[PDB]
Coordinates of N, CA and C in Angstrom, one line a residue:
Chain H
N1 N 39.6 137.1 121.2 CA 38.5 136.2 121.3 C 38.5 135.0 120.3
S2 N 39.5 134.7 119.6 CA 39.4 133.9 118.4 C 40.9 133.4 118.4
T3 N 41.6 133.3 119.6 CA 42.9 132.9 119.1 C 43.2 131.6 118.8
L4 N 42.4 130.5 119.5 CA 42.8 129.3 119.2 C 42.3 128.7 117.8
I5 N 41.1 129.3 117.3 CA 40.5 129.0 116.1 C 41.7 129.5 114.9
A6 N 42.1 130.7 114.9 CA 43.1 131.3 114.3 C 44.0 130.7 114.0
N7 N 44.8 130.4 115.4 CA 46.2 129.6 115.2 C 46.1 128.0 114.7
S8 N 45.0 127.2 115.0 CA 44.8 125.9 114.2 C 44.5 126.1 112.9
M9 N 43.7 127.3 112.6 CA 43.4 127.5 111.2 C 44.7 127.8 110.3
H10 N 45.6 128.6 110.7 CA 46.6 129.0 110.3 C 47.5 127.7 110.1
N11 N 47.6 126.8 111.0 CA 48.4 125.5 111.0 C 47.9 124.9 109.8
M12 N 46.4 124.8 109.7 CA 45.8 124.0 108.7 C 46.5 124.5 107.3
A13 N 46.5 125.8 107.2 CA 47.1 126.4 105.9 C 48.4 125.9 105.6
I14 N 49.3 126.0 106.7 CA 50.8 125.6 106.6 C 50.8 124.1 106.2
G15 N 49.9 123.4 106.9 CA 50.0 121.9 106.4 C 49.7 121.7 105.1
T16 N 48.7 122.3 104.6 CA 48.4 122.3 103.1 C 49.4 122.6 102.2
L17 N 49.9 123.8 102.6 CA 51.3 124.2 101.8 C 52.4 122.9 101.8
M18 N 52.7 122.5 103.1 CA 53.6 121.4 103.2 C 53.2 120.1 102.2
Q19 N 52.2 119.7 102.4 CA 51.7 118.6 101.7 C 51.6 119.0 100.1
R20 N 51.4 120.1 99.6 CA 51.5 120.5 98.2 C 53.0 120.3 97.6
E21 N 53.8 120.9 98.5 CA 55.2 121.1 98.2 C 55.8 119.7 98.2
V22 N 55.5 118.8 99.2 CA 56.1 117.6 99.3 C 55.5 116.7 98.1
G23 N 54.2 116.9 97.8 CA 53.7 116.3 96.3 C 54.2 116.6 95.1
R24 N 54.5 118.0 95.0 CA 55.0 118.4 93.8 C 56.4 117.9 93.5
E25 N 57.4 118.3 94.7 CA 58.9 117.9 94.4 C 59.1 116.6 94.4
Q26 N 58.6 115.6 95.2 CA 58.7 114.1 95.3 C 57.4 113.5 95.1
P27 N 57.0 113.2 94.0 CA 55.7 112.5 93.7 C 55.7 110.9 94.1
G28 N 54.7 110.7 94.8 CA 54.6 109.0 95.1 C 55.1 108.7 96.2
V29 N 56.3 109.2 96.8 CA 57.1 108.7 98.0 C 56.4 108.6 99.1
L30 N 55.7 109.7 99.6 CA 55.0 109.9 100.8 C 53.3 110.2 100.5
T31 N 52.6 109.5 101.3 CA 51.2 109.4 101.1 C 50.6 109.9 102.4
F32 N 49.8 110.9 102.6 CA 49.3 111.4 103.8 C 47.8 110.6 104.1
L33 N 48.1 109.9 105.2 CA 46.5 109.4 105.7 C 46.0 109.9 106.6
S34 N 46.6 110.9 107.5 CA 45.8 111.8 108.5 C 46.6 112.9 109.0
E35 N 45.9 113.9 109.0 CA 46.6 115.4 109.7 C 45.8 115.7 110.7
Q36 N 46.7 116.2 111.7 CA 46.1 116.6 113.0 C 46.7 117.9 113.4
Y37 N 45.8 118.9 113.8 CA 46.1 120.2 114.1 C 45.5 120.6 115.4
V38 N 46.4 121.1 116.5 CA 45.9 121.2 117.6 C 47.1 122.4 118.4
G39 N 46.6 123.8 118.5 CA 47.4 124.7 118.9 C 48.5 125.0 117.8
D40 N 49.5 125.1 118.2 CA 50.7 125.2 117.3 C 51.3 123.9 117.0
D41 N 50.9 122.8 117.6 CA 51.2 121.6 117.4 C 50.6 120.9 116.0
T42 N 51.5 120.2 115.3 CA 50.8 119.6 114.1 C 51.5 118.0 114.2
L43 N 50.6 117.0 113.5 CA 50.9 115.7 113.5 C 50.5 115.2 112.3
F44 N 51.2 114.2 111.6 CA 50.8 113.4 110.5 C 51.1 112.0 110.5
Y45 N 50.2 111.1 110.3 CA 50.3 109.8 110.2 C 50.3 109.5 108.6
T46 N 51.4 109.0 108.0 CA 51.5 109.0 106.7 C 52.2 107.5 106.3
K47 N 52.3 107.2 105.0 CA 52.7 105.9 104.5 C 53.9 106.3 103.9
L48 N 55.2 105.8 104.2 CA 56.3 105.8 103.5 C 56.6 104.7 102.5
Chain Q
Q1 N 33.7 159.1 73.5 CA 34.4 159.1 72.1 C 33.9 157.7 71.2
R2 N 33.8 156.5 71.9 CA 33.5 155.5 71.2 C 32.0 154.9 71.8
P3 N 31.0 154.7 71.0 CA 29.6 154.7 71.5 C 29.5 153.5 71.9
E4 N 30.1 152.2 71.8 CA 30.0 150.9 72.3 C 30.2 150.8 73.6
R5 N 30.8 151.7 74.3 CA 31.1 151.8 75.8 C 30.3 152.4 76.5
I6 N 29.1 153.2 76.2 CA 28.2 153.9 76.7 C 27.3 152.8 77.6
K7 N 27.1 153.0 78.6 CA 26.4 152.1 79.6 C 25.0 153.0 80.2
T8 N 23.9 152.5 79.8 CA 22.6 153.2 80.3 C 22.0 152.4 81.4
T9 N 22.1 151.0 81.4 CA 21.5 150.1 82.6 C 22.6 149.8 83.6
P10 N 22.4 149.6 84.9 CA 23.4 148.8 85.5 C 23.6 147.3 85.5
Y11 N 23.2 146.9 84.5 CA 23.2 145.5 84.3 C 24.8 145.0 83.9
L12 N 25.3 145.9 82.9 CA 26.6 145.8 82.4 C 27.6 146.4 83.3
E13 N 27.4 147.0 84.4 CA 28.5 147.5 85.3 C 28.6 146.7 86.4
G14 N 30.0 146.5 86.7 CA 30.1 145.8 87.7 C 31.6 146.1 88.4
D15 N 32.0 145.3 89.3 CA 33.3 145.6 90.1 C 34.6 145.1 89.1
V16 N 35.6 145.8 89.4 CA 36.8 145.4 88.6 C 37.8 144.4 89.6
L17 N 38.1 143.4 88.8 CA 39.0 142.5 89.7 C 40.4 142.6 89.4
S18 N 40.9 142.7 88.0 CA 42.2 142.7 87.6 C 42.4 143.2 86.2
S19 N 43.7 143.7 85.9 CA 43.8 144.2 84.7 C 45.2 143.8 83.8
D20 N 45.2 143.5 82.5 CA 46.2 143.0 82.1 C 46.6 143.8 80.7
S21 N 47.7 143.5 80.0 CA 47.9 144.1 78.9 C 48.8 143.1 77.7
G22 N 49.0 143.6 76.8 CA 50.0 142.8 75.8 C 51.5 142.6 76.3
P23 N 52.2 143.6 76.6 CA 53.6 143.5 77.0 C 53.6 142.4 78.3
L24 N 52.6 142.2 79.2 CA 52.7 141.2 80.3 C 52.1 140.0 79.8
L25 N 51.2 139.8 78.6 CA 50.9 138.5 78.5 C 51.8 137.9 77.4
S26 N 52.5 138.6 76.8 CA 53.5 138.0 75.7 C 54.6 137.2 76.6
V27 N 55.3 138.0 77.7 CA 56.1 137.4 78.5 C 55.6 136.2 79.2
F28 N 54.3 136.4 79.8 CA 53.7 135.5 80.5 C 53.6 134.1 79.6
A29 N 53.0 134.1 78.3 CA 53.1 133.0 77.6 C 54.3 132.2 77.2
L30 N 55.4 133.2 77.1 CA 56.8 132.5 76.8 C 57.3 131.9 78.1
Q31 N 57.3 132.6 79.4 CA 57.4 131.9 80.6 C 56.8 130.6 80.7
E32 N 55.4 130.8 80.6 CA 54.6 129.3 80.6 C 55.0 128.3 79.6
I33 N 55.3 128.6 78.5 CA 55.9 127.5 77.5 C 57.4 126.9 77.9
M34 N 58.3 127.9 78.5 CA 59.6 127.4 78.7 C 59.6 126.6 80.2
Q35 N 58.6 127.0 80.8 CA 58.5 126.2 82.2 C 57.8 125.0 81.9
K36 N 57.0 124.9 81.1 CA 56.3 123.6 80.8 C 57.5 122.5 80.1
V37 N 58.3 123.0 79.2 CA 59.1 122.2 78.6 C 60.4 121.9 79.6
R38 N 60.8 122.9 80.4 CA 61.8 122.4 81.4 C 61.2 121.3 82.3
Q39 N 60.0 121.6 82.9 CA 59.5 120.8 83.8 C 59.3 119.1 83.1
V40 N 58.9 119.2 81.8 CA 58.9 117.9 81.3 C 60.2 117.4 81.0
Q41 N 61.2 118.1 80.7 CA 62.4 117.4 80.5 C 63.1 117.0 81.8
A42 N 62.9 117.7 82.9 CA 63.3 117.5 84.1 C 62.8 116.2 84.9
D43 N 61.3 116.0 84.5 CA 60.8 114.9 85.3 C 61.0 113.5 84.9
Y44 N 61.7 113.5 83.6 CA 62.0 112.2 82.9 C 63.5 112.3 82.5
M45 N 64.0 110.9 82.2 CA 65.2 110.5 81.6 C 65.2 111.4 80.2
Chain V
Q1 N 45.7 128.9 67.1 CA 47.0 128.6 67.4 C 47.3 128.3 68.7
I2 N 46.5 128.4 69.6 CA 46.6 127.9 71.0 C 45.3 127.0 71.4
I3 N 45.7 125.9 72.0 CA 44.7 124.8 72.3 C 44.9 124.5 73.6
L4 N 43.9 124.3 74.4 CA 43.8 124.0 76.0 C 43.8 122.5 76.1
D5 N 44.2 122.0 77.4 CA 44.5 120.9 77.8 C 44.3 120.8 79.2
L6 N 43.7 119.6 80.0 CA 43.4 119.3 81.1 C 44.6 119.2 82.0
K7 N 44.8 119.9 83.2 CA 45.9 119.6 84.1 C 45.5 118.9 85.4
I8 N 46.0 117.9 86.0 CA 46.1 117.2 87.0 C 47.3 117.3 88.1
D9 N 46.9 117.7 89.3 CA 48.2 117.8 90.2 C 47.7 116.9 91.4
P10 N 48.7 115.9 91.9 CA 48.1 115.0 93.0 C 48.2 115.7 94.4
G11 N 48.6 116.7 94.5 CA 48.8 117.4 95.8 C 47.6 118.3 96.2
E12 N 46.6 118.3 95.3 CA 45.3 119.1 95.8 C 44.2 118.1 95.7
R13 N 43.2 118.6 96.7 CA 42.0 118.0 96.6 C 40.8 119.1 96.6
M14 N 39.8 118.7 95.9 CA 38.7 120.0 95.7 C 37.1 119.1 95.6
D15 N 36.2 120.1 95.9 CA 35.0 119.4 95.7 C 34.7 119.1 94.4
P16 N 34.0 117.7 94.3 CA 33.7 117.4 92.8 C 32.6 118.1 92.1
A17 N 31.9 118.6 93.0 CA 30.8 119.3 92.4 C 31.4 120.6 91.3
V18 N 32.5 121.2 91.9 CA 33.4 121.9 91.0 C 33.6 121.5 89.5
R19 N 34.2 120.2 89.6 CA 34.2 119.6 88.6 C 33.0 119.3 87.5
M20 N 32.0 118.9 88.3 CA 30.8 118.7 87.4 C 30.2 120.2 86.8
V21 N 30.4 121.2 87.5 CA 30.1 122.6 86.9 C 30.8 123.0 86.0
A22 N 32.4 122.9 86.0 CA 33.1 123.2 85.1 C 32.8 122.1 83.8
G23 N 32.4 121.0 83.9 CA 32.0 120.2 82.7 C 30.8 120.9 82.1
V24 N 29.9 121.3 82.9 CA 28.7 122.0 82.2 C 29.1 123.3 81.4
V25 N 30.0 124.0 82.2 CA 30.3 125.3 81.5 C 31.1 125.0 80.3
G26 N 32.0 124.1 80.3 CA 33.0 123.9 79.3 C 32.5 123.6 77.8
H27 N 31.1 123.0 77.9 CA 30.2 122.6 76.7 C 29.9 124.0 76.0
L28 N 29.7 125.0 76.6 CA 29.3 126.2 76.1 C 30.2 127.4 76.2
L29 N 31.3 127.3 76.8 CA 32.2 128.4 76.6 C 33.3 128.3 75.5
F30 N 33.4 127.0 75.0 CA 34.6 126.6 74.0 C 33.9 126.6 72.7
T31 N 34.7 126.4 71.5 CA 34.3 126.1 70.3 C 35.2 124.8 69.7
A32 N 34.4 123.9 69.1 CA 35.2 122.7 68.6 C 34.4 122.2 67.1
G33 N 34.1 123.2 66.4 CA 33.1 123.2 65.3 C 34.1 122.7 64.2
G34 N 33.5 122.6 63.0 CA 34.0 122.2 61.7 C 35.2 123.0 61.0
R35 N 35.3 124.3 61.5 CA 36.3 125.1 60.9 C 37.5 125.2 61.9
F36 N 37.5 125.4 63.3 CA 38.7 125.3 63.9 C 38.2 124.8 65.3
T37 N 39.2 124.7 66.3 CA 39.0 124.2 67.6 C 39.7 125.0 68.6
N38 N 39.4 125.0 69.8 CA 40.0 125.7 70.9 C 40.5 124.6 72.1
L39 N 40.3 123.3 71.9 CA 40.6 122.3 72.7 C 41.2 120.9 72.1
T40 N 41.8 120.4 73.0 CA 42.3 119.0 72.4 C 41.0 118.0 72.7
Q41 N 41.4 117.0 71.9 CA 40.3 115.7 71.8 C 40.1 115.1 73.2
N42 N 41.1 115.1 74.0 CA 41.2 114.5 75.3 C 40.4 115.4 76.4
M43 N 40.6 116.6 76.4 CA 39.8 117.5 77.1 C 38.4 117.6 76.7
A44 N 37.9 117.3 75.5 CA 36.5 117.3 75.2 C 36.2 115.7 75.7
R45 N 36.9 114.8 75.6 CA 36.3 113.5 76.3 C 36.1 113.7 77.7
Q46 N 37.2 114.4 78.4 CA 36.9 114.8 79.8 C 35.6 115.5 80.0
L47 N 35.4 116.4 79.3 CA 34.3 117.5 79.6 C 33.1 116.7 79.3
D48 N 33.1 115.8 78.3 CA 31.7 114.8 78.1 C 31.5 113.9 79.4
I49 N 32.8 113.4 80.0 CA 32.4 112.6 81.0 C 31.8 113.3 82.2
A50 N 32.7 114.4 82.2 CA 32.1 115.4 83.4 C 30.3 115.9 83.1
Chain L
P1 N 32.5 143.7 119.7 CA 32.3 143.5 118.4 C 33.2 142.1 118.0
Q2 N 34.4 142.0 118.5 CA 34.8 140.5 118.1 C 33.9 139.5 118.4
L3 N 33.3 139.3 119.6 CA 32.4 138.4 120.1 C 31.2 138.3 119.0
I4 N 30.7 139.5 118.7 CA 29.4 139.3 117.6 C 29.7 138.5 116.4
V5 N 30.9 138.4 115.8 CA 31.3 137.7 114.8 C 31.8 136.4 115.1
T6 N 32.7 136.3 116.0 CA 33.5 134.9 116.3 C 32.7 133.9 117.3
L7 N 31.5 134.6 117.8 CA 30.8 133.3 118.7 C 30.4 132.2 118.2
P8 N 29.6 131.9 116.7 CA 29.4 130.7 116.2 C 30.4 129.7 116.0
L9 N 31.6 130.3 115.8 CA 32.9 129.5 115.4 C 33.2 128.8 116.6
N10 N 33.5 129.6 117.6 CA 33.7 128.8 118.9 C 32.8 128.0 119.5
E11 N 31.5 128.4 119.2 CA 30.5 127.3 119.5 C 30.7 126.0 118.5
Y12 N 30.7 126.1 117.3 CA 30.8 125.0 116.3 C 32.1 124.0 116.6
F13 N 33.2 124.5 116.7 CA 34.2 123.8 116.8 C 34.4 123.0 118.0
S14 N 33.4 122.9 118.9 CA 33.6 122.4 119.9 C 33.3 120.9 120.0
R15 N 32.5 120.5 118.9 CA 32.2 119.0 118.9 C 33.2 118.2 118.4
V16 N 33.0 117.0 118.6 CA 34.2 115.9 118.3 C 33.8 114.8 117.5
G17 N 34.8 113.7 117.3 CA 34.4 112.7 116.3 C 34.5 112.9 115.0
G18 N 35.1 113.9 114.3 CA 35.1 114.0 113.0 C 35.9 113.2 112.2
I19 N 36.0 113.1 111.1 CA 36.8 112.5 110.1 C 38.1 113.3 109.7
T20 N 39.3 112.7 109.9 CA 40.4 113.4 109.7 C 41.3 113.0 108.3
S21 N 40.8 112.3 107.4 CA 41.0 111.9 106.3 C 41.5 113.2 105.3
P22 N 42.8 113.4 104.8 CA 43.0 114.4 103.9 C 42.0 114.6 102.8
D23 N 41.5 113.9 102.0 CA 40.7 113.7 101.1 C 39.3 114.0 101.5
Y24 N 39.0 114.4 102.7 CA 37.6 114.6 103.0 C 37.4 116.0 102.9
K25 N 36.1 116.6 102.7 CA 35.8 117.9 102.3 C 35.8 118.6 103.5
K26 N 35.0 118.2 104.6 CA 34.8 119.1 105.7 C 36.1 119.3 106.7
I27 N 36.3 120.5 107.2 CA 37.6 120.7 107.7 C 37.1 120.9 109.2
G28 N 35.8 120.5 109.9 CA 35.4 120.5 111.2 C 36.2 119.6 112.0
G29 N 36.5 118.3 111.5 CA 37.0 117.3 112.4 C 38.6 117.1 112.2
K30 N 39.3 118.1 111.5 CA 40.6 118.4 111.5 C 41.3 118.9 112.8
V31 N 40.5 119.9 113.2 CA 40.9 120.5 114.4 C 40.6 119.9 115.5
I32 N 41.9 119.6 116.3 CA 41.5 118.8 117.7 C 41.3 120.0 118.8
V33 N 41.5 121.2 118.7 CA 41.0 122.0 119.8 C 39.8 122.0 120.3
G34 N 39.6 121.5 121.5 CA 38.3 121.1 122.0 C 38.2 119.7 122.2
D35 N 38.6 119.0 121.2 CA 38.7 117.5 121.4 C 39.5 117.0 122.2
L36 N 39.7 117.3 123.5 CA 40.3 116.7 124.4 C 39.8 116.7 126.0
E37 N 40.0 115.7 126.6 CA 39.5 115.5 127.9 C 37.8 115.4 128.0
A38 N 37.3 115.2 126.7 CA 35.9 115.1 126.5 C 35.2 113.8 127.3
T39 N 36.2 112.5 127.1 CA 35.8 111.4 127.9 C 36.2 111.5 129.3
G40 N 37.2 112.4 129.7 CA 37.5 112.6 130.9 C 38.8 111.6 131.4
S41 N 39.2 110.7 130.6 CA 40.4 109.7 130.9 C 41.6 110.1 129.9
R42 N 42.9 110.3 130.2 CA 43.9 110.3 129.4 C 44.2 109.3 128.5
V43 N 44.0 108.0 129.3 CA 44.2 106.9 128.6 C 43.5 106.5 127.6
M44 N 42.0 106.7 127.7 CA 40.8 106.3 126.9 C 40.9 107.2 125.6
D45 N 41.0 108.6 125.8 CA 40.6 109.2 124.5 C 41.9 109.5 123.8
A46 N 43.2 109.2 124.2 CA 44.3 109.2 123.4 C 44.8 107.9 123.0
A47 N 43.8 106.9 122.8 CA 44.2 105.6 122.3 C 44.9 105.4 121.0
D48 N 44.4 106.4 120.2 CA 45.0 106.5 118.5 C 46.7 106.6 118.8
Chain W
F1 N 90.8 72.1 69.2 CA 90.1 72.4 68.1 C 88.8 73.3 68.3
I2 N 88.7 74.4 67.7 CA 87.5 75.3 67.7 C 87.3 75.7 66.3
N3 N 86.2 75.9 65.7 CA 85.5 76.2 64.7 C 85.3 77.6 64.8
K4 N 86.2 78.6 65.1 CA 85.9 80.0 65.0 C 87.1 80.7 64.5
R5 N 86.8 81.9 64.1 CA 88.0 82.8 63.5 C 88.2 83.8 64.5
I6 N 89.0 83.4 65.7 CA 89.5 84.1 66.7 C 90.6 85.2 66.3
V7 N 91.8 84.6 65.9 CA 92.7 85.4 65.4 C 93.1 85.0 64.1
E8 N 93.3 86.0 63.2 CA 93.7 85.7 61.7 C 94.7 86.5 61.5
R9 N 95.8 86.2 60.5 CA 96.7 87.1 59.8 C 96.0 87.6 58.6
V10 N 96.0 89.1 58.6 CA 95.2 89.8 57.8 C 96.2 90.9 57.2
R11 N 96.1 91.0 55.7 CA 96.9 92.0 55.1 C 96.4 93.6 55.3
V12 N 97.2 94.5 55.2 CA 96.8 95.8 55.2 C 95.6 96.3 54.2
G13 N 95.6 95.7 53.0 CA 94.7 95.9 52.2 C 93.3 95.6 52.5
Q14 N 93.1 94.8 53.4 CA 91.8 93.9 53.7 C 91.4 94.2 55.2
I15 N 91.9 95.3 55.9 CA 91.6 95.7 57.3 C 90.2 96.0 57.4
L16 N 89.8 96.9 56.2 CA 88.4 97.5 56.4 C 87.5 96.6 55.7
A17 N 87.7 95.3 55.5 CA 86.8 94.4 54.7 C 85.8 93.5 55.7
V18 N 85.8 94.0 56.9 CA 84.7 93.6 57.9 C 83.4 94.4 58.2
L19 N 83.4 95.5 57.1 CA 82.1 96.2 57.3 C 81.4 95.7 56.6
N20 N 80.3 95.3 57.2 CA 79.0 94.6 56.5 C 77.8 94.5 57.3
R21 N 77.7 95.3 58.7 CA 76.4 95.5 59.6 C 76.0 96.7 59.2
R22 N 74.5 96.7 59.2 CA 73.9 97.9 59.0 C 73.5 98.6 60.4
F23 N 74.1 99.7 60.5 CA 73.9 100.5 61.7 C 72.9 101.7 61.5
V24 N 71.8 101.9 62.4 CA 71.0 102.9 62.5 C 71.1 103.9 63.6
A25 N 71.4 105.2 63.3 CA 71.3 106.2 64.4 C 70.6 107.3 64.3
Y26 N 70.3 107.9 65.3 CA 69.4 109.0 65.6 C 70.0 110.2 65.3
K27 N 69.4 111.4 64.8 CA 70.1 112.6 64.9 C 70.3 113.4 66.1
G28 N 71.5 114.1 66.3 CA 71.6 114.7 67.6 C 70.6 116.0 67.9
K29 N 69.8 116.4 66.8 CA 69.0 117.7 67.2 C 67.5 117.1 67.5
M30 N 67.3 115.9 67.7 CA 66.2 115.1 68.3 C 66.3 114.7 69.7
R31 N 65.4 114.5 70.5 CA 65.5 113.8 71.9 C 64.9 112.4 71.9
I32 N 65.5 111.7 72.8 CA 64.9 110.4 73.1 C 64.5 110.4 74.6
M33 N 63.6 109.9 75.0 CA 63.1 109.9 76.5 C 62.2 108.9 76.6
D34 N 62.4 108.2 77.9 CA 61.9 107.0 78.6 C 60.6 107.6 79.3
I35 N 59.2 107.1 78.9 CA 58.1 107.5 79.6 C 57.3 106.4 80.2
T36 N 58.2 105.4 80.7 CA 57.6 104.2 81.6 C 56.9 104.8 82.5
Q37 N 57.5 105.6 83.6 CA 57.0 106.3 84.6 C 55.6 107.1 84.5
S38 N 55.5 107.5 83.1 CA 54.4 108.4 83.0 C 53.1 107.6 83.0
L39 N 53.2 106.3 83.2 CA 51.8 105.4 83.0 C 51.1 105.2 84.3
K40 N 51.9 105.9 85.3 CA 51.3 105.9 86.7 C 50.8 107.1 87.2
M41 N 50.8 108.2 86.2 CA 50.5 109.4 86.8 C 49.1 109.8 86.4
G42 N 48.4 109.7 87.7 CA 47.0 110.1 87.6 C 46.3 110.5 88.7
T43 N 45.2 111.0 88.7 CA 44.2 111.3 89.9 C 43.1 110.6 90.1
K44 N 42.5 110.3 91.3 CA 41.3 109.6 91.7 C 40.2 110.8 91.6
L45 N 39.0 110.2 91.4 CA 37.8 111.2 91.6 C 36.9 110.5 92.7
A46 N 36.6 111.4 93.7 CA 35.9 111.3 95.0 C 34.5 111.4 94.7
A47 N 33.8 110.6 95.3 CA 32.3 110.4 95.2 C 31.7 111.6 96.1
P48 N 30.6 112.3 95.6 CA 30.2 113.4 96.4 C 29.4 112.8 97.7
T49 N 29.4 113.6 98.8 CA 29.1 113.3 100.1 C 27.9 114.4 100.4
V50 N 26.8 114.1 101.3 CA 26.0 115.0 101.9 C 26.0 115.0 103.4

């Protein structure tokens, strides 16, 4: 009864970890402007 | 055995979150200091 | 023998109310009197700003 | 028993039009699940 | 004609006669680091929203 919510929420956690690690290892190179989570699909609009 | 741990009211009684000791905290502090100095030396020339 | 300092990490975002409450707490959790100290002057300035 | 707990979240996440900036506190607008075909046109809703 | 001492015939007794500059060097047990990039390390504070 909560498959989609759980999946999108888990993807939110995954994206948070991804942003944290890319910020820690390579500071300032990539800045995230928008994050998009739907199903197992993930999208990012960023500035390089 | 020690009177200062006697609890007569439930105000000072609470849930247990975690537990630590000296042999863990000493190596934890050493690890923190070494990690800090290594990170500072690695981030800059 | 141990002095605290403020840490910032660009990869995280948090509710500013947490910072405000932490700034309130730091004024009565630590000691910076005339005998010894527990925090750096920069951390004291940050707590005052908070 | 699953429904008893999970009903309000399925109800809540149906809304659309949230802010998706990474520095925004609310996580409601981040999830695009449910934010599809609300207008009814593929070209209109996906103009981003 | 050039008024410079490019090539000179020098005796062996005065080979080491050109030691007149004062040089300053740092100990090998101390470190030298550049902190120019440390001036941009900072974080922003977001205004609270209701």
